[PDB]
């Protein structure tokens, strides 16, 4: 009930229901506030959208702590009283004295929960060829400094241990590193990017019943799983990591090349200035001034 | 020909050319990537787009300078050697200490140019009602600030001078304004939120040969001008400061709408996750991991 | 007893002890962690020695909501479950909105209290003359704006009512603020700049049992009062706005000069890279290292 | 002669005299403007006092390119028209693509020069034992990235190859290191933590004519070498790491002493507020205010 609580809101979601918890991948605010507008119960805040958005790069580990906290901590927050925002972290961003950092600074910015995942430092998108990871006692180390952190802190924060090991190393090698992940207290798993629908329900009925999330990347190469198939298979979360960054470029090109070749944007009229500052929270503001004494409103 | 030279590539467009010069309004790194992919010769970075994006907020004077010097460092140098931006440096974010720190800044950043307007500090976008603006002499006091930096910087950059009078005092106030502004040595004049076409064309006529800039404000309360109107106005840059945050919000509401209602994001398949990378740069990236002796990729 | 939880921390120091808090003023991580080492029961972050050291500047109303939150943030969380930190923050960055945004920010941030003032927009350093303030009425806007803001966060936030109006409106004037600040909702006030020490027992005794806050200006222009006079007159809390801007410089600027003619930095030994690492949480690293079964370290 | 040609000036110190280029260690707005107080001619970013000031955290690879570059940033140009800034850049944050990251904001934010080392990425400071290096083709790979992308941007950046391999790998191991930087570019090498005053005259001569750079750290675990003695040996630069962040802990530390015991300060009554505001820039804003025509100042 208290503000700043999407720890403790999408803790409950997983421990007190058995609902497939949906949460669509957002990048920045306007992606955020859209979702929010739209009543999803949580949300997912992706790195590679992170990376396209505020720093205009691909997904190679080119965003850092800093960035990622920053763009979490911005959209866990534009409403105190909202759904509970997943990050993703990504490595960790270093060894374990920064994966304890970084859990640290997501926690205190109140973000719900992180995935964690075994690639190696110099990382890359999960869907990309030639991803490498570490060893598993070298990812356990990390799962070690997260969990480590969220119990210092006295925190519900959700970690999800994610395993990039399925394209180098086999399904049976990403199932022990969940299994070992498990045990050092991760709270949820994911095998990221499953090669086959009957791959997914296996691996939900291998750590069964410790709940996994499903991780559908848009046009990726991965299967596409619907909402009521991931459910049926017994997923408790699922993220949709590229839901609005994929779209927004399709709709953004569109309008450009109608600019460049005929001299108008031609949006919708009803997306207009005004509505875009509603979804952003202009009423809330206009409140705080006129709330305040102030006659600017 | 040099790189972060955006000052002076965009002066010699404006003073080596009688080209209509069209920058898209952009917000973050996917905006002004695709931009850039289809060969835009400018930019526009719009201040409305990077409050809604970076912060989530409303254009009520929330993003200062740190989070606009910001996105627009991180959009002017996506490509060193790529188009010059244009960037929305509202008031200046304080009196003219601020005003020169700013410009100072902005410069420094690569940023081509800028529009600095005449708002009370508590500004907000100029398409909404309630907007006051200063003094004359206070307005210019600003000008004067920012026109003195970029002097003692020894840079070509291109401040514009934009009055938001024309909804409060009227058109012969504005034009007294940008005549004072011209005076005090901006480049470009903005009159911001036309009320006819008629009007538009007139401004022009009444500052001539002065250059003018017409901000395109997508389902706006300014009339549709086209860019074909528009360069037989005689205006010299036109921006569009919705073409990107309008239609990126169209098309991630109606994905999110499918994604709750069916369960699919349904986003067109050509929008892979390599694409997007594509757009924002991957390439590059792993031309310099190949490049450097690297086998990552 | 929670991390994170300065606020409640002030709070009871505040309601229930008749302890005078003493607030060294801190401006960075090493100033922080010096006063943190010395067992400091609060803190307090200088807006002054934050635009010094984070941007080089003079308080002249150069650091923003941004820099000042990212200081803030940073300082109140190098220990989690260490002293409260009272933060600096100056006029609030703009009218309502902004006050209420940075208040909520703080708050989030960990930030126990701040101190909020009358100066007008463009301000300036407390002890430099040529220093306005607005209106009565305008300065009730921002206490309101920043007492609804921690209310509606159910924050424990400690609000400080600064006025500087005394330079320019007389002690009379003052006086009245306080008293309608207090009636606002503000916690504590702070009258800036006593000219003589009878006045700030005077000060004390008109607002009484509202508790007070002095501000000591090291080497400023108002009365050297020492912890055991403002004990005795009745104030609660008692900062040090440049308790260690002031020494470092003169230490830095000692130092440099001994390199600059003599070739050596001459700096007392004991100072070593790990005593300074020491002092900055290298403990506290190693042990996140070791325990996660890193062996690093 | 040109604003924020700072790696020219370092260039034309470097190639066109023969002086012992001395670098004060700077790590924040004061300490770098008390540097500039006092004449020198180029100034030394550290990365250990950025990391304890900025972040208030020990040198164990906690500081990323964000806040190291948002540091040199801000020091570098404090004065467009001042000396020259050498910044830490440490392993380059990352694989290839981050040092060329790392190396492309260095210098767009002009700074003059930087030192990339060989240590593995979880680095730490390097008078700390326990320091890994990597292998020379994975060092020379960031030392080739490094140098491609100064040239690609057409830039008179100065790259220090610094190798820390003394500790675990020996002398020749080092020489080897630097010859084979060198070839690929870099501009001046840095052999990390002599171990005697023989051995650090040696290597000049190794290297020679092809400069190196001397880092003094100040009550450290290498020589004290003295400025005549380091001209003597042949060193180019020498940068002094500690030269500030040391003394200003010890003023910080017996101030705050004295605070705690004695309720007072005691700072020499010279270090005024407006002394420091005067050292932070005071003049220059006041003429900004007073040249655009304010009458705030
Ligand atoms: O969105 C993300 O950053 C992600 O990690 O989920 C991903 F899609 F990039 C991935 O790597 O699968
Ligand atoms: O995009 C902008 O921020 C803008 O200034 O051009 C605007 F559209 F918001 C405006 O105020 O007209
Ligand atoms: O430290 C501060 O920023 C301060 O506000 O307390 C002050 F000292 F600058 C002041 O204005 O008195
Ligand atoms: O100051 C620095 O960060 C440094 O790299 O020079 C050092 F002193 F920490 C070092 O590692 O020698
Ligand atoms: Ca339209
Ligand atoms: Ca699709
Ligand atoms: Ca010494
Ligand atoms: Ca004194
Ligand atoms: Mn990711
Ligand atoms: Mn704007
Ligand atoms: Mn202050
Ligand atoms: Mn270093």
Chains 1, 2, 3, 4 share one sequence.
């Not at 999408?10 to 421990?15: G, Q, T, V, Y």
């Not at 559908?216 to 990591?241: C, D, Q, Y």
């Not at 709709?251 to 109608?258: D, F, N, P």
Request: charged content about 25%; proline content about 4%.
């Amino acid at each position: 009930d208290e503000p700043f609580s999407g720890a403790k809101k999408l803790r409950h979601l997983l421990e007190n229901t058995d609902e497939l918890i949906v949460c669509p991948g957002v990048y920045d605010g306007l992606s955020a506030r859209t979702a929010m507008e739209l009543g999803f119960k949580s949300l997912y805040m992706t790195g590679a959208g992170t990376t396209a958005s505020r720093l205009g790069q691909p997904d190679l580990a080119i965003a850092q702590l800093h960035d990622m906290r920053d763009n979490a901590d911005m959209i866990a927050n534009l409403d105190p009283f909202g759904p509970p925002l997943i990050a993703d972290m990504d490595t960790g961003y270093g060894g374990p004295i920064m994966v304890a950092r970084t859990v640290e600074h997501y926690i205190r910015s109140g973000v719900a929960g992180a995935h964690l995942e075994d690639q190696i430092l110099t990382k890359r998108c999960g869907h990309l060829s030639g991803k490498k990871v570490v060893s598993r006692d070298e990812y356990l180390v990390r799962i070690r400094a997260a969990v480590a952190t969220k119990r210092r802190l006295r925190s519900d924060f959700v970690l999800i241990a994610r395993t990039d090991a399925l394209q180098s190393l086999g399904y049976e090698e990403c199932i022990e590193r969940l299994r070992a992940a498990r045990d050092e207290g991760a709270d949820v798993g994911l095998l990221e990017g499953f090669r086959s629908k009957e791959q997914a329900a296996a691996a939900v009925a291998a750590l069964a019943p410790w709940p996994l999330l499903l991780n559908s990347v848009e046009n990726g190469h991965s299967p596409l799983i619907t909402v009521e198939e991931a459910k049926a298979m017994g997923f408790r979360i699922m993220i949709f990591s590229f839901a609005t960054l994929a779209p927004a470029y399709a709709a953004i090109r569109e309008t450009l090349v109608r600019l460049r070749d005929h001299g108008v944007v031609g949006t919708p009229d009803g997306i207009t200035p005004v509505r875009l500052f509603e979804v952003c929270g202009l009423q809330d503001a206009m409140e705080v001034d006129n709330g305040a004494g102030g006659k600017a409103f």
